[PDB]
UniProtKB/Swiss-Prot annotation:
Residue span relative to the full protein: 344 to 455 of 801
Localisation: Nucleus; Chromosome
Listed name of the protein: Bromodomain-containing protein 2
Subunit structure: Homodimer. Interacts with E2F1. Interacts with (acetylated) STAT3; promoting STAT3 recruitment to chromatin. Interacts with CTCF; promoting BRD2 recruitment to chromatin. (Microbial infection) Interacts with herpes virus 8 protein LANA1.
Entry similarity comment: Belongs to the BET family.
Phenotypic consequence of residue 39 to A: Reduced binding to histone H4 acetylated at 'Lys-12' (H4K12ac)
Function, in words: Chromatin reader protein that specifically recognizes and binds histone H4 acetylated at 'Lys-5' and 'Lys-12' (H4K5ac and H4K12ac, respectively), thereby controlling gene expression and remodeling chromatin structures. Recruits transcription factors and coactivators to target gene sites, and activates RNA polymerase II machinery for transcriptional elongation.
Effect of residue 87 to A: Abolished binding to histone H4 acetylated at 'Lys-12' (H4K12ac)
Stretches assigned to the Bromo domain: 2-111
Gene name as annotated: BRD2
Additional comment: Some specific inhibitors of BRD2 that prevent binding to acetylated histone are promising therapeutic molecules for the treatment of cancers or inflammatory diseases. ABBV-744, a small molecule, has been tested on tumors with success: ABBV-744 antiproliferative activity is mainly restricted to cell lines of acute myeloid leukaemia and prostate cancer and is able to displace BRD4 from chromatin. GSK046 (iBET-BD2), which specifically inhibits the second bromo domain, is a promising therapeutic small molecule for the treatment of inflammatory and autoimmune diseases.
Domain of life: Eukaryota
Entry note about domains: The first bromo domain specifically recognizes histone H4 acetylated at 'Lys-12' (H4K12ac). It also specifically binds histone H4 acetyl-methylated at 'Lys-5' and 'Lys-12' (H4K5acme and H4K12acme, respectively). The second bromo domain recognizes and binds histone H4 acetylated at 'Lys-5' and 'Lys-12' (H4K5ac and H4K12ac, respectively).
Amino acid sequence: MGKLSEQLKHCNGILKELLSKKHAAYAWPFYKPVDASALGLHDYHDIIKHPMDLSTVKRKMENRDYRDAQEFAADVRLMFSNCYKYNPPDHDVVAMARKLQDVFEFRYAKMPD
Ligand SMILES: CC(=O)N1c2ccc(-c3cnc(C(N)=O)nc3)cc2N(Cc2ccccc2CO)C[C@@H]1C1CC1
């Protein structure tokens, strides 16, 4: 549905990396939408108004929902922010989020322009 812009190509590369086996040890909690019912997190949707995850970002990229790199970045950061909002700062999943966000932020900073 049309070639991605040069900056969105970079974003797509980053997304591929975040989903790759390379980072699976800490990326796995972010692969799919939080299933609040299944995990017994019955307050999750009261606290997190805009859930986000990497599969949703992937779908949006494929569907050309993102019009620029900034919109893509906002969803990725929304995902991490949701994790930092819902979970205590000493939780294992928060440590994983910080590590995956480090991967994201450092490569996002290498955006071509
Ligand atoms: C994305 C996010 O904020 N969350 C999060 C999202 C998804 C999953 C997850 C759990 N199980 C499976 C599975 N069954 O394969 N896949 C993903 C787990 C979490 N963790 C739990 C969790 C993460 C990592 C290590 C240990 C645990 C303790 O169980 C909590 C949190 C949550 C409180 C909001």
